[PDB]
Coordinates of C-alpha atoms in Angstrom, one line a residue:
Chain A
X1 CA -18.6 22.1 4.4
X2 CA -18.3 18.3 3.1
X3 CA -15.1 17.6 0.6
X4 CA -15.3 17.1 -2.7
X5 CA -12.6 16.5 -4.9
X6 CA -11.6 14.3 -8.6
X7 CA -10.3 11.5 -8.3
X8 CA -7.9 9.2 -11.1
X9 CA -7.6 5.9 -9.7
X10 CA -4.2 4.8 -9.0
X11 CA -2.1 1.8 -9.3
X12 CA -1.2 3.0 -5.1
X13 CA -5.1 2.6 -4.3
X14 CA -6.5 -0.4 -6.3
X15 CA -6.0 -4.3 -6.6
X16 CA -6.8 -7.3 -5.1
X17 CA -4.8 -5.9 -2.3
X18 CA -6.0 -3.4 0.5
X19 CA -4.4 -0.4 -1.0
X20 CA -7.9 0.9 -2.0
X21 CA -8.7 0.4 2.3
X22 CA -5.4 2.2 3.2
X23 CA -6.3 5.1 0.4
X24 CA -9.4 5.3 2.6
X25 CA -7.9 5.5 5.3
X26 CA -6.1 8.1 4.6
X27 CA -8.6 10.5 3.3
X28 CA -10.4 9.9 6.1
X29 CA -7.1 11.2 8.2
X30 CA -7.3 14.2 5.9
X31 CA -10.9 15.0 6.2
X32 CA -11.0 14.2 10.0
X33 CA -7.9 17.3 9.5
X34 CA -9.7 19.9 7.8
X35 CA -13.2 19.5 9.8
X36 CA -12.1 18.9 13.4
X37 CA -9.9 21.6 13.4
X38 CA -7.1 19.1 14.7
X39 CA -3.3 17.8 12.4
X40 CA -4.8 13.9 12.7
X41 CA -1.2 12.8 11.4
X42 CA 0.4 14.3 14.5
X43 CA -1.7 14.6 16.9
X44 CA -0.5 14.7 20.0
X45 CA -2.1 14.5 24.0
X46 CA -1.8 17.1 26.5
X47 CA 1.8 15.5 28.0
X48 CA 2.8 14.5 24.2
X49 CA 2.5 11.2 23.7
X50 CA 1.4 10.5 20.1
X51 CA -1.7 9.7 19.4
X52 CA -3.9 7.9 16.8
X53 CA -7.3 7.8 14.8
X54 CA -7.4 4.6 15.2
X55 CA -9.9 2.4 13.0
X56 CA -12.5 0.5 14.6
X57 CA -15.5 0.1 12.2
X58 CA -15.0 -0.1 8.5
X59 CA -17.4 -0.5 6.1
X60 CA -17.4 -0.7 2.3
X61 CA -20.3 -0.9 0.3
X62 CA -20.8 -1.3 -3.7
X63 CA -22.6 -3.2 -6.1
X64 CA -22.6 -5.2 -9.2
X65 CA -22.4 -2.2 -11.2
X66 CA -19.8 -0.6 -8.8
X67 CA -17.5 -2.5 -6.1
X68 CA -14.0 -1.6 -5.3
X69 CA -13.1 -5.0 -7.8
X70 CA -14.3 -2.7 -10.3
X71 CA -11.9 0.1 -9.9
X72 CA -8.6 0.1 -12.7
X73 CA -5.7 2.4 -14.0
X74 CA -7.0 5.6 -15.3
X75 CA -10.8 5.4 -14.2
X76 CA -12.5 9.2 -13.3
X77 CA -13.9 9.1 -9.4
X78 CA -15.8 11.7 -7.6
X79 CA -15.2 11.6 -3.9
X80 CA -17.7 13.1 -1.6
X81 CA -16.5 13.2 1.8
X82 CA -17.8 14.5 5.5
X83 CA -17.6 14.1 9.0
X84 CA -20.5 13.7 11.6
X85 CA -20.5 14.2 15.2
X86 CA -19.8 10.9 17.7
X87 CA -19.0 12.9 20.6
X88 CA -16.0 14.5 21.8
X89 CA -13.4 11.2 21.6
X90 CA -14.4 9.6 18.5
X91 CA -15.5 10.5 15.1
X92 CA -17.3 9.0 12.0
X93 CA -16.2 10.0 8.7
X94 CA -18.2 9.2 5.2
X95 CA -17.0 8.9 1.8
X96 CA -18.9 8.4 -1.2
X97 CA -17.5 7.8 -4.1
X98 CA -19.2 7.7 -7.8
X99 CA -17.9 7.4 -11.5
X100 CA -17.2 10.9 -12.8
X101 CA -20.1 12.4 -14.9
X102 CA -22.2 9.3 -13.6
X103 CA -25.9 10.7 -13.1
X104 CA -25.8 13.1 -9.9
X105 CA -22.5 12.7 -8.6
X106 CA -22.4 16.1 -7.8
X107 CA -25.2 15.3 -4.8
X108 CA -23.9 15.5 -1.1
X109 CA -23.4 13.3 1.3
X110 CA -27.1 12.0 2.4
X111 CA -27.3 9.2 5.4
X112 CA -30.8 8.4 4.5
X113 CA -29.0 7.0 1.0
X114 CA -26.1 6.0 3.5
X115 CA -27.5 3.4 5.8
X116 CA -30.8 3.1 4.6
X117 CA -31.0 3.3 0.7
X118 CA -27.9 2.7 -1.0
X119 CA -27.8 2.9 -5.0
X120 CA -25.9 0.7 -7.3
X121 CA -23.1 2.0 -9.2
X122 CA -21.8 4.2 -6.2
X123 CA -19.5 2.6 -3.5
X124 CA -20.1 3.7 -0.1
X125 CA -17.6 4.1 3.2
X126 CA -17.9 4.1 6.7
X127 CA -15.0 4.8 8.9
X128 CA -15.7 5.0 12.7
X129 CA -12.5 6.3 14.4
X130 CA -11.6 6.9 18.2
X131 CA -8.4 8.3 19.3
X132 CA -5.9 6.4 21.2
X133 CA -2.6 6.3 22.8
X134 CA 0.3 3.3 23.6
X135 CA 0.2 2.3 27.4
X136 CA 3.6 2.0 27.1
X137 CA 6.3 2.8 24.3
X138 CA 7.1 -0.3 21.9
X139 CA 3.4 -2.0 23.5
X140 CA 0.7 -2.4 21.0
X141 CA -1.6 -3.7 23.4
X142 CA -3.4 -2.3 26.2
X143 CA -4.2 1.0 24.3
X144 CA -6.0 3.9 26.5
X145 CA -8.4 6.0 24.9
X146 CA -7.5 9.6 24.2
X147 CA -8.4 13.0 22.2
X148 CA -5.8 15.5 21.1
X149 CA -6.7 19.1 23.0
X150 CA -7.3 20.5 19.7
X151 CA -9.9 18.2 18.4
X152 CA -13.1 19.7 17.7
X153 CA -16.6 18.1 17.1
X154 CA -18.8 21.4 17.8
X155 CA -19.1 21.7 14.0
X156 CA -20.2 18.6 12.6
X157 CA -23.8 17.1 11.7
X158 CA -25.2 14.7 14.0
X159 CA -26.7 10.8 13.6
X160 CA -30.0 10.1 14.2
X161 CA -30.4 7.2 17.1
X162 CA -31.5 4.6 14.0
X163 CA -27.8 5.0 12.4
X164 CA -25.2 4.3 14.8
X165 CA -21.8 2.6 13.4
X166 CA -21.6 1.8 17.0
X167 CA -24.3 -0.3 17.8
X168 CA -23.3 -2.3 14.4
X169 CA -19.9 -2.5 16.2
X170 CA -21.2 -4.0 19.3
X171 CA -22.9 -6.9 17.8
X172 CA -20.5 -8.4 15.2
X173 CA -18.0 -8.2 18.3
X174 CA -20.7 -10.5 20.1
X175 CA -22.3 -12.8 17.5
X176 CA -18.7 -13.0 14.8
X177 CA -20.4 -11.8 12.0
X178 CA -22.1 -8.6 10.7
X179 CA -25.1 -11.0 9.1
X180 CA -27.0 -12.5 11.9
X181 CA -26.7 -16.6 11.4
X182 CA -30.7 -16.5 11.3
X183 CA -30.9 -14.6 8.5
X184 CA -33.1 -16.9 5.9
X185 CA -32.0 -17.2 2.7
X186 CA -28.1 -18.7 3.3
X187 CA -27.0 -22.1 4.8
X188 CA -23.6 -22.1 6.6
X189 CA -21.6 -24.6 5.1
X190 CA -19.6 -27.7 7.1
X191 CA -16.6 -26.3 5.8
X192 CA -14.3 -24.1 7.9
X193 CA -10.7 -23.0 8.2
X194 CA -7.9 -21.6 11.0
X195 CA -4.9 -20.2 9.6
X196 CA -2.1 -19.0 11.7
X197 CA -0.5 -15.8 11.1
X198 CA 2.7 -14.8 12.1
X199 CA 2.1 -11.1 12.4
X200 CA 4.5 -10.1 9.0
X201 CA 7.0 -7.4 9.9
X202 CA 7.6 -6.0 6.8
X203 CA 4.0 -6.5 5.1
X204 CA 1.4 -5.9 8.4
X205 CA 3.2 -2.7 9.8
X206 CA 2.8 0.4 9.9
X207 CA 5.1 3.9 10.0
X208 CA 4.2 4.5 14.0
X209 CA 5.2 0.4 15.1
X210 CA 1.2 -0.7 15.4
X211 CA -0.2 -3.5 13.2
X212 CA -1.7 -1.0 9.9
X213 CA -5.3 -1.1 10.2
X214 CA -5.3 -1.7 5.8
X215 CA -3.4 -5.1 6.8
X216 CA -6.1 -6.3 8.3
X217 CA -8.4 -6.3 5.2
X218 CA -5.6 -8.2 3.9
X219 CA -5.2 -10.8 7.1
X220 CA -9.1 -11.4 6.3
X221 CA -8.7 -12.2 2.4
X222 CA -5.9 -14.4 3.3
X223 CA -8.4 -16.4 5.4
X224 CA -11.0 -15.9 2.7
X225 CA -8.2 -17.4 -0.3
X226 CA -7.6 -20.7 2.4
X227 CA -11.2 -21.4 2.5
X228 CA -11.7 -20.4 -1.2
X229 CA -9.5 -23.3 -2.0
X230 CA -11.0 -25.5 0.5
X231 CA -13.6 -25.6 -1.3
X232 CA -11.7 -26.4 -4.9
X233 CA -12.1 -23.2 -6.6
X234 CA -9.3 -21.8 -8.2
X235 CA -7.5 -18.1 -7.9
X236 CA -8.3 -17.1 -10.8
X237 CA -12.0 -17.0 -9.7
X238 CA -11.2 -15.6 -6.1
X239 CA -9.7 -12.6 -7.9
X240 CA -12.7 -12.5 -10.3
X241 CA -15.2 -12.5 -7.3
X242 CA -17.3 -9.2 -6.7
X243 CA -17.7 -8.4 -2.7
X244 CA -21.0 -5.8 -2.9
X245 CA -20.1 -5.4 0.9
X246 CA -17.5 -5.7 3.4
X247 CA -17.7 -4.8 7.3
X248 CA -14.8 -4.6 9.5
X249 CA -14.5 -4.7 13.6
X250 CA -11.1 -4.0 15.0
X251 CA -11.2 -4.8 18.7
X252 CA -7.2 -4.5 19.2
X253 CA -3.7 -4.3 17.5
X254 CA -1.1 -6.9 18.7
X255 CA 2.5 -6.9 19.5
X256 CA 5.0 -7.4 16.7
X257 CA 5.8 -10.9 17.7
X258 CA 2.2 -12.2 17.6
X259 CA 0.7 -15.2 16.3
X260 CA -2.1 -14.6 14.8
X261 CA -5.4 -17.1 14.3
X262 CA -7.8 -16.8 11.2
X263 CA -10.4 -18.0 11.5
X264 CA -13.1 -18.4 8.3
X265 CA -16.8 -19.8 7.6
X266 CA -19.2 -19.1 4.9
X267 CA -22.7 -19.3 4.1
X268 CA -24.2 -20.0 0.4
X269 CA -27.4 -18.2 -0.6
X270 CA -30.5 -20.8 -1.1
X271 CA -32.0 -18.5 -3.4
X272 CA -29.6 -16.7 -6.0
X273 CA -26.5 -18.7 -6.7
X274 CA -23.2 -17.5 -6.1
X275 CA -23.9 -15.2 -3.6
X276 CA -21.9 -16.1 0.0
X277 CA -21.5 -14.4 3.3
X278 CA -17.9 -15.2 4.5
X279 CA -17.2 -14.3 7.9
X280 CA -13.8 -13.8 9.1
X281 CA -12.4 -13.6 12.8
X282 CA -8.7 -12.6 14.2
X283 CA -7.6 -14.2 17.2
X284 CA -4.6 -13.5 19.6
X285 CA -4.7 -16.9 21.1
X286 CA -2.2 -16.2 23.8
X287 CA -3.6 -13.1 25.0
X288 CA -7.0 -14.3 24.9
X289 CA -7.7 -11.4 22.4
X290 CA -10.1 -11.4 18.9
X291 CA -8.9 -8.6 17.4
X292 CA -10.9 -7.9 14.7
X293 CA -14.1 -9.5 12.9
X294 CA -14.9 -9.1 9.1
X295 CA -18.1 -10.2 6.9
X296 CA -17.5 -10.6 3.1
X297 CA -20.7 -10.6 1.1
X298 CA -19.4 -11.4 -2.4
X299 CA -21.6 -12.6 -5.5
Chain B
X1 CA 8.7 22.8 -15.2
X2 CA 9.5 20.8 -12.3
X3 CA 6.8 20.2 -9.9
X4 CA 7.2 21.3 -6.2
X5 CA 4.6 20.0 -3.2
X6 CA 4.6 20.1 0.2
X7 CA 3.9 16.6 1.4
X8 CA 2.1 14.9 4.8
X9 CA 3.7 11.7 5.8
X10 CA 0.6 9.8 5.9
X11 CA 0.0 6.1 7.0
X12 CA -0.5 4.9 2.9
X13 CA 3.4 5.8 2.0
X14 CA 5.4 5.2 5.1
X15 CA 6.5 2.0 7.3
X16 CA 8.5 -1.0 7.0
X17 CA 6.5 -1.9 3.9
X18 CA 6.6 -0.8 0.4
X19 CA 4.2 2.0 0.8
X20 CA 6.6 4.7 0.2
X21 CA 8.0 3.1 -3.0
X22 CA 4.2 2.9 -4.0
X23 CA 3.7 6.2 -3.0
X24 CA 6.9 7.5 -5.2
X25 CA 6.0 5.2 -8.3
X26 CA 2.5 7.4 -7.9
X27 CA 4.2 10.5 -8.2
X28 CA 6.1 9.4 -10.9
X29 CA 3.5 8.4 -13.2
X30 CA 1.5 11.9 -11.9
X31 CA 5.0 13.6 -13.1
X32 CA 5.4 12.0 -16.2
X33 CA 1.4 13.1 -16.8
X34 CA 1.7 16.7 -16.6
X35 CA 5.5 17.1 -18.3
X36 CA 4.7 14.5 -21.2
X37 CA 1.4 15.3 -22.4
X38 CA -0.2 11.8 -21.7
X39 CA -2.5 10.7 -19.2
X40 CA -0.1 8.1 -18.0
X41 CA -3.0 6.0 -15.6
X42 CA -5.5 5.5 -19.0
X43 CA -2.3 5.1 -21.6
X44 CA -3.3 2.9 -24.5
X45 CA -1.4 2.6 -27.9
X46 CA -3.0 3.3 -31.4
X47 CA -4.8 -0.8 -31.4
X48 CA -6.6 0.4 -27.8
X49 CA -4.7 -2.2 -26.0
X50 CA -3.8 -0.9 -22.5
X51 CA -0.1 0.5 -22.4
X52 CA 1.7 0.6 -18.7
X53 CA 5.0 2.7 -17.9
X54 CA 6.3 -0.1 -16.3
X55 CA 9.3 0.2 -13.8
X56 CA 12.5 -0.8 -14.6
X57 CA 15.0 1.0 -12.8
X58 CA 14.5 2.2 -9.1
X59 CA 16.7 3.8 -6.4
X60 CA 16.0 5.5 -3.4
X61 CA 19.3 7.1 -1.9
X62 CA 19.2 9.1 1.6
X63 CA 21.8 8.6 4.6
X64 CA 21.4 8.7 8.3
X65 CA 20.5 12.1 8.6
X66 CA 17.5 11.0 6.4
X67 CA 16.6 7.7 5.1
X68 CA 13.2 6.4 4.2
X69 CA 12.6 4.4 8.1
X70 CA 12.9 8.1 8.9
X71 CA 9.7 9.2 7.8
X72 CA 7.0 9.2 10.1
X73 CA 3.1 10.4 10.6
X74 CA 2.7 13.7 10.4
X75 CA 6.2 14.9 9.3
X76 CA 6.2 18.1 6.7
X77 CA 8.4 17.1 3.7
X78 CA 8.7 19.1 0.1
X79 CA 8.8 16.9 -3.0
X80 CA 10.5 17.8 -5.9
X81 CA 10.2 16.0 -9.5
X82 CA 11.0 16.6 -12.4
X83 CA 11.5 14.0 -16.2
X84 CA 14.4 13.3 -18.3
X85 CA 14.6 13.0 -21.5
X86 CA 15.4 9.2 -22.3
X87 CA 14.0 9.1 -25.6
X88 CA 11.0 8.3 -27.5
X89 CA 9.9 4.8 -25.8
X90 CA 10.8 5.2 -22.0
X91 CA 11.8 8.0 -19.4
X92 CA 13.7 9.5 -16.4
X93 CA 11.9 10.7 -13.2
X94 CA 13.6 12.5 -10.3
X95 CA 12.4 13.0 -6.6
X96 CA 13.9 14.9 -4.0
X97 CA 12.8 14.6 -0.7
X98 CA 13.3 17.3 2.1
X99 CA 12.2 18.0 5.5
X100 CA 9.7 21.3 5.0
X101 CA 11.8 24.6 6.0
X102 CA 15.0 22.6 5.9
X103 CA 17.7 24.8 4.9
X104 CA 17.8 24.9 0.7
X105 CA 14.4 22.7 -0.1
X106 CA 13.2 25.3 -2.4
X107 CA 16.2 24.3 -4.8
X108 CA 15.6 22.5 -7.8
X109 CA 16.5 19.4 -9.6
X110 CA 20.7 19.2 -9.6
X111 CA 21.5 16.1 -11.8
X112 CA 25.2 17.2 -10.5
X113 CA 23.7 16.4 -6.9
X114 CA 21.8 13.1 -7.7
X115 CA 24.7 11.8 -9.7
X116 CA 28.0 12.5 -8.1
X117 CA 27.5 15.0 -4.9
X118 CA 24.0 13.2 -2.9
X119 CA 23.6 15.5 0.5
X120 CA 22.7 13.9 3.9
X121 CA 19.2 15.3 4.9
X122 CA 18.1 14.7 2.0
X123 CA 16.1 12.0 -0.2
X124 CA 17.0 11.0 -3.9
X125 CA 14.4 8.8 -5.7
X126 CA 15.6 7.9 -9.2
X127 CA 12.9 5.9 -12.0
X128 CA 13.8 5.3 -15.1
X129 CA 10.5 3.6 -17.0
X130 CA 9.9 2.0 -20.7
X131 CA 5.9 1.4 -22.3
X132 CA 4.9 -1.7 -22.1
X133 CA 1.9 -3.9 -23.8
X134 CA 1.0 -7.4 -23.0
X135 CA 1.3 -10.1 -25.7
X136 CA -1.6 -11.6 -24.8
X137 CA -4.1 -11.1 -22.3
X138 CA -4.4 -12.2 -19.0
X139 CA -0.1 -13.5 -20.0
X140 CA 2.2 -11.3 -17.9
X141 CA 5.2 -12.7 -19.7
X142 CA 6.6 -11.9 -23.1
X143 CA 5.8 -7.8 -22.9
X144 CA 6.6 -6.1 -25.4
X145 CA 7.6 -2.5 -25.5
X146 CA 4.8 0.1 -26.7
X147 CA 4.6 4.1 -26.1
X148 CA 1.1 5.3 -26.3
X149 CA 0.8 7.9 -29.2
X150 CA 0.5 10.9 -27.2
X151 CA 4.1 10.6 -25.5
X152 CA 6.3 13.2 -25.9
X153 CA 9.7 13.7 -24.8
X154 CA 10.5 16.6 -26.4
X155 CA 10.0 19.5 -23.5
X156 CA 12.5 17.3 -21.6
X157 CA 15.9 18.6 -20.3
X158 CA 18.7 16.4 -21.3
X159 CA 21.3 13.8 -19.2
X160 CA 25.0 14.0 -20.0
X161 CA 26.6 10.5 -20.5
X162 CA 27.8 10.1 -17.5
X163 CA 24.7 9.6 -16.0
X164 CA 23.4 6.5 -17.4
X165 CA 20.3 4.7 -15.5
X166 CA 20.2 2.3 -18.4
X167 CA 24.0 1.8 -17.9
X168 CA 23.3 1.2 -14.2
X169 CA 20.8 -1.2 -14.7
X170 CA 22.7 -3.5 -17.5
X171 CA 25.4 -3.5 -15.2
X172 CA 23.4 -5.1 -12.3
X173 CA 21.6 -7.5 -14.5
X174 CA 25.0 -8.9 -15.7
X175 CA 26.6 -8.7 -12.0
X176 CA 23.3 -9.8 -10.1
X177 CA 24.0 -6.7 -7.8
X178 CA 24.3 -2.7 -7.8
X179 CA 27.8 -2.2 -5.8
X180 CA 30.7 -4.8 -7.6
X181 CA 32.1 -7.5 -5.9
X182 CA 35.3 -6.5 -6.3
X183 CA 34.7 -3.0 -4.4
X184 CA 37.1 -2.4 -1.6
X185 CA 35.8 -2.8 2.6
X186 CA 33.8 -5.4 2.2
X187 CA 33.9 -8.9 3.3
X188 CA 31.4 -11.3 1.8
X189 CA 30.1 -13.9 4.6
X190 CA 29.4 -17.7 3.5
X191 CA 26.0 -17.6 4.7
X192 CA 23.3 -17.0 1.9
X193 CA 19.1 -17.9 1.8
X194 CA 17.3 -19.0 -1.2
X195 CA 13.6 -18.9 -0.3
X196 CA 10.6 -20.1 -2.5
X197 CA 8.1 -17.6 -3.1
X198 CA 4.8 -18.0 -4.2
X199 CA 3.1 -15.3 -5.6
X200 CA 0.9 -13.8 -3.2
X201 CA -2.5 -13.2 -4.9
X202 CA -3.8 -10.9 -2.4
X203 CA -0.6 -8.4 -1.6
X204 CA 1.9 -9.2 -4.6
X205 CA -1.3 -8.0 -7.2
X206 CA -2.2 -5.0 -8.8
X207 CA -5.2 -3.4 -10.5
X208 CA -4.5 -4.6 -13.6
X209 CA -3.3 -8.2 -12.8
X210 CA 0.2 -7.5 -12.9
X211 CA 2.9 -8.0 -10.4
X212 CA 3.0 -4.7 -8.2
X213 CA 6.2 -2.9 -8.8
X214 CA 6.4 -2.0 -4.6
X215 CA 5.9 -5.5 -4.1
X216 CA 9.6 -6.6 -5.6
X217 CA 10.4 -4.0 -2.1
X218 CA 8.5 -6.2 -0.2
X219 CA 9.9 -10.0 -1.6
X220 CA 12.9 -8.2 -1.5
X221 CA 12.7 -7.6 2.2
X222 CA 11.6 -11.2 2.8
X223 CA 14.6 -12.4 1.2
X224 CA 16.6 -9.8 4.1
X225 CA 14.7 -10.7 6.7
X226 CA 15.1 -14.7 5.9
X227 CA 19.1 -14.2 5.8
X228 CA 18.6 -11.6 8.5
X229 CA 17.1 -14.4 11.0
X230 CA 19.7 -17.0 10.0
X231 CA 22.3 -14.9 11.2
X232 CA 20.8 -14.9 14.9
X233 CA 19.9 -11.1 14.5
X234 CA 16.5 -10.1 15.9
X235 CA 13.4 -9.1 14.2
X236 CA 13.1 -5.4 16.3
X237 CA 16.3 -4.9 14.9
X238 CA 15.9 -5.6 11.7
X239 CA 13.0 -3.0 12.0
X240 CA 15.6 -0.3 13.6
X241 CA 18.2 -0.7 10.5
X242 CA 19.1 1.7 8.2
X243 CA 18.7 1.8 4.4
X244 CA 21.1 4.4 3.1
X245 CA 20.5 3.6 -0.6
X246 CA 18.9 0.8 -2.7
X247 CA 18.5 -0.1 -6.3
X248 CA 15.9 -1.9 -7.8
X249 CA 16.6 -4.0 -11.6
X250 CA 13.2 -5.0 -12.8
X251 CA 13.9 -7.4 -15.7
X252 CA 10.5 -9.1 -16.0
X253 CA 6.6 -9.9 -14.4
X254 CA 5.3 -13.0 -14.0
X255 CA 2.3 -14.9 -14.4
X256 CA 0.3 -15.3 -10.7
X257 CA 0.6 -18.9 -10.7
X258 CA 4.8 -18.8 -10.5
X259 CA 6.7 -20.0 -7.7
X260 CA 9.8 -17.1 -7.3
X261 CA 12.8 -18.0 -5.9
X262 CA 14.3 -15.1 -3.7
X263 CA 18.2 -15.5 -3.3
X264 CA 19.8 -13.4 -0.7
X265 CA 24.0 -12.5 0.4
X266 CA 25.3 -10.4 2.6
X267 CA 29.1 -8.2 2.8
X268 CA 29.9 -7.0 5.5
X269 CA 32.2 -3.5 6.0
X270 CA 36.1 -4.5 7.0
X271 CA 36.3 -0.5 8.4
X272 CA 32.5 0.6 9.8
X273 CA 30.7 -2.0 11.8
X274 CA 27.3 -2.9 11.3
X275 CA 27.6 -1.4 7.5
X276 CA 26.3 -4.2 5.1
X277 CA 26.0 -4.7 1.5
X278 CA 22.8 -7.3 1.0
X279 CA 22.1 -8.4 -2.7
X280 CA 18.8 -9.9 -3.8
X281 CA 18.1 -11.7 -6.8
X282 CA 14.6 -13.1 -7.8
X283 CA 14.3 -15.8 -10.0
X284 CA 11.6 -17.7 -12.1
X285 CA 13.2 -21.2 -12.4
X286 CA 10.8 -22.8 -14.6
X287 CA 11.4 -19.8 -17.0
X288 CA 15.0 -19.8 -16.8
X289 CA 14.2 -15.8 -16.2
X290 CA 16.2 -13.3 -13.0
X291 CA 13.0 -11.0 -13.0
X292 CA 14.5 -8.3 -10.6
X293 CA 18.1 -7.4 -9.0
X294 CA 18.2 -5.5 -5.5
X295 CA 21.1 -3.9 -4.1
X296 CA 20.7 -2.9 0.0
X297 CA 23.3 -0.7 1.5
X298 CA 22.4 -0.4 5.0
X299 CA 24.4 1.2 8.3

């Protein structure tokens, strides 16, 4: 049985920020709860070491007539959410979200509409998850994969082989971006930025010690805001911008002391003007490490 | 009728951050909804222009037996809320926070307890909020105060007055902190900060182009952490302290151009070690305007 529930946007889950992300997030802790048979937010191994859902692909897509820019105190949502099977370590959780009393919000969840035909004017989440554990206590790195002996997948709808968060997973971790660069209609501009990032121990944390996967999301638009004004824009246009879609790779966390590297690029559109591809990589220099890759599509 | 719920510590309102001050100022608006008769999220006054119950006083009181770095994933808590009558233009909401099945949660709202007798163990969030309207759009300065036509007060139980948020909060906008300088056990040390902050478009932001109230927590804690580090202390353990109580002054917003100036100094206890007293005052200088007043008692 797939989740429905109403929705009144919050000044805790919208913004420029990544509260909408972490809001996200955490429904997708909840859902993960109530169809895996399993208490995600204390889940615990066989010999009781916590451990987590942890985010590794993230995807939010909207449109013109509906991107997460859009969202503002007050506003009516309909959530639709369910879980589908990934096997027996990992899990992939959908949410989509529509305008209450919009035309057919009441439909469920359809991954046809999903991965293959989205519609404009309802926003559109991925959240592939995998369960993990420290190594050791107060390291965020070197994280072994896990499953809580309660957790249950015997229940949920399966993928077909064509949709497979996954495989979309294993190539922006190889090629940096979720766009291939030989995609035609874009040229990738001269234009580039690094940004260190002192990992920020009161901003980029989170309640269990581990970098907060929502931070992220924020690491990435703080790249984004460098190259923005690169370029010469001006903030009040990046806070104006619409991003239709945003992917998100997260390869690893990072200790509490880290400097992290932000990397940015971004391709224009030859073809409709102001539309940009803006790919975003986090780097763990010293360990050797990228951590997680993003790609902004914004128009 | 004050509103009971049993209460998940989730990832989106825990963790060195502001996400549980987020989290609260959520309830409170979801508090002041139901017991006021006015969809707080969507207020507008009688012209249609947007009306926001803006924050102006905040505290968060617990102790080491519970304390706001206690809260973790997972742990089982029961909220309690309730409003207070302030009047025809702003208004009192109450929080208490206990551990699920902890001896008394089922209690309710003791202004005797909040006040005067606070019990370890347990959680006291205090926000006092007044309507606000912009003066002109996309200005975040020069608010002036509103109430949407649907608000009323007049269901509300009553403070005595003795307990005076309003009081409390004059008091620390004259002082420039909560706890007086002439209160006994406490030296004040000769090191101070003043850092320059510039408003962080992506995480100091929200929904309707405002300054985030949590995000005050958040420059607040940079303004610790800054004076934290000049002292020599280290930055895992100024992730271990101990927040016993903190109050929040709001006194303005700002437009998201401004460069704050975040002044921190510190007192330290003459009769418990490690028990500190750390004011915070941030500033717009080329306003002339103190826009907020924090007070941190920490063990």
């Amino acid at each position: 049985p797939e989740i429905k529930q109403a929705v009144t946007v919050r000044p805790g889950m919208c913004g420029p920020g990544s509260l909408f992300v972490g809001q996200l997030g955490d429904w997708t802790w909840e859902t993960v709860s109530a169809q895996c048979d399993t208490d995600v937010f204390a889940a615990r191994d066989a010999s009781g070491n916590p451990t987590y859902l942890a985010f590794y692909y993230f995807r939010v897509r909207g449109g013109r007539e509906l991107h997460p820019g859009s969202l503002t105190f007050g506003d009516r949502l309909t959530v639709t959410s369910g879980c589908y099977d990934q096997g027996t370590e990992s899990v992939l959780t959908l949410h989509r979200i529509d305008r209450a009393g919009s035309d057919d919000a009441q439909r469920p969840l359809d991954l046809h509409e999903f991965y293959e035909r989205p519609r404009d004017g309802s926003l559109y989440v991925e959240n592939f998850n995998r369960w993990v554990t420290r190594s050791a206590p107060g390291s965020n790195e070197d994280l072994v994969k896990s499953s809580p002996p309660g957790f249950r997948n015997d229940g949920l709808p399966q993928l077909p082989a064509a949709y497979s968060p996954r495989a979309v997973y294993r190539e922006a971790r190889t090629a940096h971006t979720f766009r291939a660069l030989d995609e035609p209609g874009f040229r990738l501009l001269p234009d580039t930025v690094e940004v260190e990032h002192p990992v920020d121990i009161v901003r980029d944390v989170n309640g269990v010690g581990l970098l907060y996967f929502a931070s992220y999301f924020s690491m990435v638009d703080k790249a984004a805001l460098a190259l923005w004004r690169r370029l010469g824009r001006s903030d009040r246009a990046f806070l104006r911008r619409v991003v239709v879609d945003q992917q998100m790779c997260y390869l690893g966390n990072a200790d509490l002391d880290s400097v992290l590297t932000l990397g940015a690029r971004v391709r224009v559109s030859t073809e409709t003007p102001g539309e940009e591809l803006v790919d975003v990589v986090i780097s763990d220099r010293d360990s050797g490490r990228v951590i997680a890759v993003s790609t902004l599509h914004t128009q």
